[PDB]
Amino acid sequence: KTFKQRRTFEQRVEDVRLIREQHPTKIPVIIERYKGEKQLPVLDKTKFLVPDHVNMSELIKIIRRRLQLNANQAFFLLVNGHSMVSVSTPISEVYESEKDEDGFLYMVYASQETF
Ligand SMILES: [Cl-]
Numbered sequence: 001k002t003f004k005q006r007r008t009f010e011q012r013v014e015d016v017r018l019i020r021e022q023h024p025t026k027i028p029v030i031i032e033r034y035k036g037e038k039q040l041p042v043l044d045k046t047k048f049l050v051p052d053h054v055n056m057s058e059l060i061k062i063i064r065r066r067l068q069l070n071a072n073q074a075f076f077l078l079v080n081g082h083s084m085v086s087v088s089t090p091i092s093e094v095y096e097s098e099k100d101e102d103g104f105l106y107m108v109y110a111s112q113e114t115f
Pocket of ligand 1: 022023024025026
């Protein structure tokens, strides 16, 4: 069901390598709904090419807009399995430090703080 369960390690690496070749200024991000989430909708896709100059605060806003959330819906985002240290961090730096060995940057969202 999850991205890693649907694609082999080889397939994931080769896709990241393709993204470096054809979309060099983008960060390859996998964004998935927490498996127990009951309030927030699922996204229309899983793999996102994020401009590498945005910060985490902006990425949160982007994802909230893609989910068409209103102001009273809570949204929490994990990166590489843990909470964000700061929303101010540039995504190019987050990628360097938090990328998976397959080359994707993995994120999970939920409406509660306890995924
Ligand atoms: Cl590009």
